Design a protein around this ligand. Sequence first.
Ligand SMILES: Nc1ncnc2c1ncn2[C@@H]1O[C@@H]2COP(=O)(O)O[C@H]2[C@H]1O
Ligand SMILES: Nc1ncnc2c1ncn2[C@@H]1O[C@@H]2COP(=O)(O)O[C@H]2[C@H]1O
Ligand SMILES: Nc1ncnc2c1ncn2[C@@H]1O[C@@H]2COP(=O)(O)O[C@H]2[C@H]1O
Ligand SMILES: Nc1ncnc2c1ncn2[C@@H]1O[C@@H]2COP(=O)(O)O[C@H]2[C@H]1O
Ligand SMILES: Nc1ncnc2c1ncn2[C@@H]1O[C@@H]2COP(=O)(O)O[C@H]2[C@H]1O
Ligand SMILES: Nc1ncnc2c1ncn2[C@@H]1O[C@@H]2COP(=O)(O)O[C@H]2[C@H]1O
Ligand SMILES: Nc1ncnc2c1ncn2[C@@H]1O[C@@H]2COP(=O)(O)O[C@H]2[C@H]1O
Ligand SMILES: Nc1ncnc2c1ncn2[C@@H]1O[C@@H]2COP(=O)(O)O[C@H]2[C@H]1O
Lengths: 194, 191, 191, 194, 191, 191, 194, 194
Amino acid sequence: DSSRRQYQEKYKQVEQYMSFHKLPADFRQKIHDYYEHRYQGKMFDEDSILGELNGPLREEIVNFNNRKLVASMPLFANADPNFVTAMLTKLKFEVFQPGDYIIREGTIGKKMYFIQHGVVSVLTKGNKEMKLSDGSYFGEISLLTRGRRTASVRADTYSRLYSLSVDNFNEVLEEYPMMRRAFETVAIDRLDRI
Amino acid sequence: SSRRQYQEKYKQVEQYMSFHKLPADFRQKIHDYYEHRYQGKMFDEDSILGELNGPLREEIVNFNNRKLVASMPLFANADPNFVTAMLTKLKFEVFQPGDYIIREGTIGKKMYFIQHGVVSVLTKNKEMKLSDGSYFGEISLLTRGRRTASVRADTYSRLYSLSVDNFNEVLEEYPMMRRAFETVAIDRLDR
Amino acid sequence: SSRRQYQEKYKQVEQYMSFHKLPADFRQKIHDYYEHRYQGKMFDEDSILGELNGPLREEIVNFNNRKLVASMPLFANADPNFVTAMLTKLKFEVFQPGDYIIREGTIGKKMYFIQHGVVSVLTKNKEMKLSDGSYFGEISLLTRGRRTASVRADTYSRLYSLSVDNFNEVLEEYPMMRRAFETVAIDRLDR
Amino acid sequence: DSSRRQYQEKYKQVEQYMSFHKLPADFRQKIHDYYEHRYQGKMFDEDSILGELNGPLREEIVNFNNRKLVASMPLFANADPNFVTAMLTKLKFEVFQPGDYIIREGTIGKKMYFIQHGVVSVLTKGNKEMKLSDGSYFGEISLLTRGRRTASVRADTYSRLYSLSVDNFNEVLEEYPMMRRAFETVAIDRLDRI
Amino acid sequence: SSRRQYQEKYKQVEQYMSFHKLPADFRQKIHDYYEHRYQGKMFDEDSILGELNGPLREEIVNFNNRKLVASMPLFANADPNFVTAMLTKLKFEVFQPGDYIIREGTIGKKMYFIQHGVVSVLTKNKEMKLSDGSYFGEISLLTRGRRTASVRADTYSRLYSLSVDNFNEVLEEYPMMRRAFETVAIDRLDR
Amino acid sequence: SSRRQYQEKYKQVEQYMSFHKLPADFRQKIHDYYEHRYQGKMFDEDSILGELNGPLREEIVNFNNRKLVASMPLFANADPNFVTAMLTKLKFEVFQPGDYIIREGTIGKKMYFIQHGVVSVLTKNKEMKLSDGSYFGEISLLTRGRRTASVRADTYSRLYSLSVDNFNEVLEEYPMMRRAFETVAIDRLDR
Amino acid sequence: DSSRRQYQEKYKQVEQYMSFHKLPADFRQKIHDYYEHRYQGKMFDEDSILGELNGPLREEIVNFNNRKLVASMPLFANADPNFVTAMLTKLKFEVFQPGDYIIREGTIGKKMYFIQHGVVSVLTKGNKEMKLSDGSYFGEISLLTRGRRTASVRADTYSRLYSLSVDNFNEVLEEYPMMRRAFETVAIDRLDRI
Amino acid sequence: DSSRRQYQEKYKQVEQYMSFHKLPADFRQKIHDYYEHRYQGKMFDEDSILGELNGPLREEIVNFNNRKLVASMPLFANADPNFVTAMLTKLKFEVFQPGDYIIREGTIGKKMYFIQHGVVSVLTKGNKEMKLSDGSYFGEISLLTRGRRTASVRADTYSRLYSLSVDNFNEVLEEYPMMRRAFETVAIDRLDRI
Ligand SMILES: Nc1ncnc2c1ncn2[C@@H]1O[C@@H]2COP(=O)(O)O[C@H]2[C@H]1O
Ligand SMILES: Nc1ncnc2c1ncn2[C@@H]1O[C@@H]2COP(=O)(O)O[C@H]2[C@H]1O
Ligand SMILES: Nc1ncnc2c1ncn2[C@@H]1O[C@@H]2COP(=O)(O)O[C@H]2[C@H]1O
Ligand SMILES: Nc1ncnc2c1ncn2[C@@H]1O[C@@H]2COP(=O)(O)O[C@H]2[C@H]1O
Ligand SMILES: Nc1ncnc2c1ncn2[C@@H]1O[C@@H]2COP(=O)(O)O[C@H]2[C@H]1O
Ligand SMILES: Nc1ncnc2c1ncn2[C@@H]1O[C@@H]2COP(=O)(O)O[C@H]2[C@H]1O
Ligand SMILES: Nc1ncnc2c1ncn2[C@@H]1O[C@@H]2COP(=O)(O)O[C@H]2[C@H]1O
Ligand SMILES: Nc1ncnc2c1ncn2[C@@H]1O[C@@H]2COP(=O)(O)O[C@H]2[C@H]1O
């Protein structure tokens, strides 16, 4: 494929970067593993392709790609499908590796995360650790309160996540103000536990 | 002396109404309002409270509004610091029977807590009544949309109003308390 | 007593004019203005209306301005809530013969509704007269451009002014009412 | 042509995207049809080409390309030609397919649309449906009032549209404030009907 | 005469407390506050200082606060223009024993300089006392974070408060003086 | 009666100075200021001018400031509408010998026009004197930089001040008048 | 050269654009002439090249390229050379063709222009026309006053100009506030004439 | 390498630029020397590569690349490692040549600089000159005070620097407000000396 070729060419550049900066062998291996998991040996100009489409098609694509995730989350499954679409269109796919701190306690929070596939651990001084998996979200509390992160969140497995920025969160909720309650209920219940 | 202050202030009202040649029934309506709102006594509340400190102002506003606070779970079951923050922002208002407190379709700049009285919520279908210990006008404040209904006083109504700016300021400090308002709004929108 | 309030307030004016050694003709001009503007009676209108509630303030402003409202299709044929929103924002002003109410080329911060009087619109060619039931100063408010003409009082003129900020605020609530002003502005610009 | 080649290369990437995400056959067909209608088998870097020009030439091009559309609309035909130019320069070409919801009732409106070629249906709860075609525009009401969309608008045919953002609408009308009346008159007449 | 002004102002307080039916102990608490805060004399300080010029206002605020200034290195060892800028912004406040001047976890809008009195800093562990010549409430102003502790008056306490906006304004002119506050904040956060 | 108003206002000053135990020499300094600033007469100028209309306020401010206007080409040779815009924004201030009107290195928030008096411009070298018909403090307003010099009153000095916000507002309407200030600033910076 | 090749490849794209939009023969000729004058048969990624440099080198380059223009203008020749550098760094090269309206009277003005090489005519209702040439600038008045353009300015010859945006004009003058007087003196003298 | 090739291709473009603008021989030599020092004969799309990664990996890379610099500066060595990471992620690598004015006295300051490797001279009217080298920073004072530059700073050797913008400086210190004191202490001590 032209896409397998693009991936190979891009990763060759990554190897040249890593050698230029004399990254240790095991570090280069970690980066290689990331690239394989994130891109699965194929690359295309996604922003370019999607930008060449129109609104309806982009919305149809994002709804199709996220079918299963949507159905597994009462947040979305039960919602106005236009709210679901507005949310989906703002999501950014990210992949984390085992051990990664996705969120660090006490920092400024600018994103939340929806778990497509993976296991993460929520870590608080007053433990023990609490796990979240497919169909859950986290990082909402800072977005709601503008306070610092209430816990750290560490990937236990390779985790395929979708992030939503605080600005995009606030934009969607300007259009669908009553959907704020869904996030607040989860946040309140979590704050009560910790 | 606050009786004298009232009588002096009302004499100025009378001279205004005379200058502008308001008809007798209207002047009587204004007289009745003044009696219900001020109860024959007036003082410069702003200057008085401004002479005090934060703790005393807060103690006073809590004492004055004990019934309001105990009347709604919103306040009764909340962080007392949230309650105090809200109370300090409330403005007392009296409405007369027939008054349109809120008009459907307009921009919403305030919500209202009912201390005593009965109002009718009017939508284009039967009127829905609200009374002591309820609030209304919250939906515009939450959504920034236009008023979803008219609200008309059925009886003399003693209300406390809260401006949209003050609502947002308090909820900046107490963000999770937004949920209490949203629950009421969602239930009402469904209905 | 509002007669006494007037006479006391005017005595303070007299002491100001004396301190600053204004010439006799100028002092007479100020005296005549005071008589026309206040008609021998004064009261703290702001404090009075501030003691009332929204409904009564709105009832009063509508009653006081019945003639103005009926005099122009702008108000006469509009949503009465738009009319009330506009009226609440109006400031009463009296001008004397020869007064330049608006100067060509300056920044426009207000428009004016004529309750009673005659003004001349002056462009660099014959003067165009406007009288009871007309308005002017709208073009700057619409365009943010400089004044297209001077406007000078021919007679004692009783006007209501509306600030650019208030104009924009009302039209935020009533966006389609902008068209009424634009139609007048376009016709005048063509002429 | 170098432009036919560019289109072919770009569409190959689109096929690789669609296969990667396992899009259904009929969905891939819909996307293929869109690409053919939107680009007509040719691609170039339009933003790059136009960006290499100067102001006068860009304005001459946009006026030429839109000759017929302009003449068919009393909005433009009767206007200051500098207003026409200012408007034209802000327009974004979009193509919609039969059945597409271009506008959904009740949502936040951030664009209006001018119809170059196509038929659309305006749909309100209090129907019946009203059709608009070449030389008409829609979506103006939200732009004027900042209220939510008063109706849905669905493409009945392949529709070649030019969108104008609310920011660009407001910018042009800052320069030509009296032209706001043209949009208001249409909006008022439509609000009276619905 | 300022004794007469005090007695008149306090009579208005009494009429307020009577209207709102405050209990006797509360009325006594308010009486005691008034005596400590105003010491039997009242004047319109704002109007008085507003009648003066900048130099005289600055001379007065420096003279009135000599003890405060000499009591802390922050002021004692600083650019006298910084000291004057700060002093002009301070608001005098009196608190009574038991008053929560600052509540932990709330939004911080002010800091406080102790002229005379003792307060307890309370954290969830033994109380830490602060007295004449110390300040508190600085940490929220620096960080924009919530209050790290409660601060409660142990004695009648005569404080000067400085708003967050005024704090930031002064430090815009005197940016390096931020370090003095930061040093105190860091030491306290470590503890 | 404005003599009575002065004497009443000054009695309140005396009670303030007594409460705060200002020393005799300082009280005398304040007394002398009051006499020079108000000349034994006081009235509520703000309320008085607020009772008038735009034309009369403008006529009054022009009449009161004829000498200032004729004394500087800045005003004397300018669009009279610019002159009026500036005058309406000026605040009268009196300074005493030795007063530091401007301190070098501080943030500049005002400039000053000399009606009557002598000031010294002080730079770290010989003092440069300015008198009737000159202005100073313009450089900070133009550049947003810190004050380039100190300016100290040598005699009792009757000045009009213009705030940086008001300066910028007027120059928004009259942009080419900025050049008059810049020419003075450039000449002074060179020197 | 790689630069002659890049130009040829880019212009081929321009021809494909022009044929796609069926531009008239004489219009295509005008565009061809523009490209030859503007780029002189060579193209490179200038923003990329300059972006690869540092501050000092960019400043040395801009000062060198504009040596002659600077010396011919008392505005710059007499100024703080750091002011000259700050101004030069914000300038955008543009080329106009004979007959082009560079500025139209009555419009909102967002740029001024410095003439490197060319002749333009300033046109006012109260004429006659006034010519400006190498080393002059125009369009300053709107930038100073925020008023509408006081005249039209039309290129009489091929004109090689440098534009300066109102934002960039205001930025430079924040750093060098006393240099505002130079522009004001020219503006005042011109307003007096017209 | 693909990276050596990219560098060669890019530098060929630079030569074509320099010849087009007829830059003097010694000037072209200075630019050549800069390119060799800055890029060391290799080029890749660094922003592209780093943008393809996730947060954790970018942070691991920046921490690794800057190991030695961090350890040599009590500012960082002693700090919350999350503060160090936040700072590092905002830094921009720049290379200056002997004689370059990195900062000019009296100008508006929008950046500060950390010295990775090089010697610079701080120059004040009230001299003499003061040198700073590896592990030092400069330009902090304008960032703290918003005043004009208090001195000029000139590179004595080839200097490998990391710049931090005023906006990025203020952003990091919003998250770590007490770290402002470290910069203030250095600034105060320097202002006392000059
Ligand atoms: N008890 C809990 N159970 C599950 N998740 C939690 C719990 N407490 C906190 N979290 C999550 O951890 C996140 C840390 O970042 P935030 O505080 O922004 O949002 C927090 C929640 O999403
Ligand atoms: N079904 C309902 N029952 C009670 N109150 C309502 C109902 N619907 C609307 N309201 C109230 O009427 C108010 C009208 O103004 P708001 O839309 O701001 O907020 C609305 C609610 O507070
Ligand atoms: N031909 C005209 N007839 C009546 N009034 C006019 C005419 N031209 C201008 N005006 C008014 O004069 C006003 C001067 O200020 P404005 O430009 O703000 O608004 C202008 C109009 O209201
Ligand atoms: N009666 C009507 N006839 C034609 N178009 C309409 C009518 N009513 C609404 N529309 C259009 O449908 C659009 C829906 O989005 P807007 O409300 O922004 O703008 C609306 C109008 O452009
Ligand atoms: N260990 C301490 N010793 C003295 N004062 C403290 C200590 N910890 C906190 N404080 C003060 O208590 C204040 C509570 O409000 P702030 O967090 O704004 O600022 C805090 C400090 O001024
Ligand atoms: N050489 C000079 N002659 C007269 N006045 C000066 C001179 N230098 C500075 N000033 C004035 O002193 C003022 C001090 O404050 P500013 O810098 O704002 O503006 C300055 C000028 O108005
Ligand atoms: N008399 C004149 N001589 C030369 N140039 C002029 C004259 N009048 C106007 N201009 C220029 O024409 C420009 C038109 O746009 P601006 O008004 O922004 O700025 C104007 C001046 O630069
Ligand atoms: N005495 C000094 N020793 C070392 N560096 C200095 C000294 N004085 C000034 N500098 C640096 O030179 C910089 C010039 O720009 P800034 O004023 O922004 O910040 C200044 C300091 O970082």
